[PDB]
């Protein structure tokens, strides 16, 4: 029973639930379903639900997900990838959405910035959510985890040295693999904003656009003000409110 | 959306749903949540939702699950174990129950016979469902599967280490489960079901060293429909008082 | 070098060769290639090359193969199946034929009786030899090995009790599996004789015909005099000389 | 029939054949039989028959083999190991050599560099080819493969036990080989090829406890084409006197 999944935490009036390691907020509404994914917080800061304020006064159904809870010593998530390096966490998110949402999937919108944008893409491309509106995702996920936390990277690489570089490249290509194996016949509605001052994620955006190009999948991209900062976020929020 | 998960099949007036290859019936009631798991049908017979007749005229919330849809050559299920031999299928079942149930887990009852009883044990021990009322479950899964289908076991094998991993898959659940849960496990078995009486003693040994005391009962019949008749009377008696 | 593969044995003037555990005779000729497989000899009798006499005065190319050399305590062969229960022995036979034969495959003819007929079928259906002319093959190979040698069966079943019945049914269906996975688009030229007094192998022939029927593969079958004996063989030899 | 095995490809006037997915060149000569094995080409380059230029103007019998045709994503070969990780491919090579060679095995010479040298060792140690003249072979196969292609290693893995089985696949050949054969194994390695000098010491340790004394020689270069130049001079010197 949903109410028995509560953690005791409360975010802006919304009670937190946890199912099979997946923490989420749920507000039942009408017309549309809005789904958000959390990005990396700073070290020693708890993972935060993204873009609640934009939607708690809305009448839409709202689900906001956090990343995983491991590793314990730097519990800022593993890019929505299980420690078995598979889809078990994305699958849990998918089940929660399909059972708690009261709209069609084409009336479902996936939102997220940076790591959250990758999460939205990973879920949408695995389980055919066509509406993905994100900002500045990474392309090579392991290269980026390395810059944010050596602890999270080391944990995800595993303990055996035989497989560390294997796991590294596997994680590094996890999203790119999702693009290559996704259903090219779906009417994808993917928008990716990026700050014009964000040289890194501008390059990552070219890598992603290239993979979508190879799959004959047209993507909408819009450059916006800012870098990897709150000015880009501010323009991103304005962008996805216009669409939705 | 749940209504978008309908397969178009209807079983006894109950619509069928499917999420992540997991097919289930769902009927919202009150008071209690009853969960059933499918057992092995005969070789060329489709998988059946078990004990639906016992609970269509009841006011309880009811969920009946089928096993997996593979292998295609013999689609009778892989003991609720994925092709990767992990918890992926039990994960989906757990998510379906937790989000569709309108009762507490202590008011939830897992039911099943033979392979259906293993499924109930696999789910309950993994995700702390205390009420498990089953009949004649197997303990060594691969040993039983090969007597029912060489096709399914070989598909699940992908050879030696896989055999032991499947064979002990339920015993490992017992070894791993939460000893401090107030377990309410009832296991019946036919008087004449010698194979599964021994299987029950193998399961009891694992429960025993985990300090889990289960309830058992001999009923008439073998590994047959006579036993299932008395099993059904047993779980109706337990659930209603 | 072929001459360095000799065993020192000599059968009717033909020197025996052995390559990777596979014993064979080879006489180079013209026009056609004749390939024979050995059947079960009696216990404590060496495996025999089949139908040499019919072809040593012929001008055709001739290859005669024996079964495997294991188990050591009853070395009468394992139905041309390796002790890993795979195609490694058939593959060796195929290589020898493709390298020593000087005709096309449709001018190649596979001959054999009983166990040898199964060998011919196993090779022909794995590697697309269309001309197969055999007598009284078995259908359920393990059931038949059980009647001939408990020692060979036990050896092929392996040592671990977990897999004995698995291996039994696997061997029992080895030829039937070959029929189901064979190329149905090949112009098969398969003739199967059987003695009218051979109730057992008449039933096995119905099982085989059924599998060929399911694959939409037409087979020629002819009932001949005798049982599982030298009268059936005698009529079988006459039959395959008429075709070739 | 051999002529029916032609692929239709021609390499430097030599027709290509294929038997059981094994692609080879064959040129009948006299006196000696020279066997070469292909090494890893770059990522998007087709597999090459090695050292064909050294032996087209020679009167020797010549066979050059490629590695396997899988995986399709990166078809540079699986170290002459089948997808089932067994001797199936070396079996076919052995059959081709034994039936097409017109010289004794003591007049047969296996050649190859890097992965090509492993292939020569795998064949020679399995089927008692005494003359092996190679450059800079690897000893831990999986450790090297992953630095050249994550795609090929993962295909070969199908994970942990497979890694060790592949990594030690050549070392097990040494452990299993015939100690009483009059082995004639020459292994060269570039002065500056530190990785493979250490790899050679790992191979030497296995030969050592099998009472097999090999011949080794430092040549100039690293794991590069400078070393291959001196390797080629070395095997021409050995073969001709
Ligand atoms: Cl981030
Ligand atoms: Cl069952
Ligand atoms: Cl026989
Ligand atoms: Cl190489
Ligand atoms: Gd435009
Ligand atoms: Gd513009
Ligand atoms: Gd007619
Ligand atoms: Gd007629």
Residue numbers in the entry:
A (entry chain B), C (entry chain B): 1 to 244
B (entry chain A), D (entry chain A): 1 to 158, 164 to 246
Question: What does the publication say?
Answer:
The key enzyme is the O-acetyltransferase CsaC (MynC) encoded in region A of the CPS gene cluster. A deep positively charged groove, which traverses the protein surface, allows substrate binding and opens into an active site that is characterized by a catalytic triad composed of S114, H228 and D198.
Consistent with the oligomeric state of CsaC in solution, the crystal packing of all CsaC structures contains a tetrameric assembly with two protein molecules in the asymmetric unit.
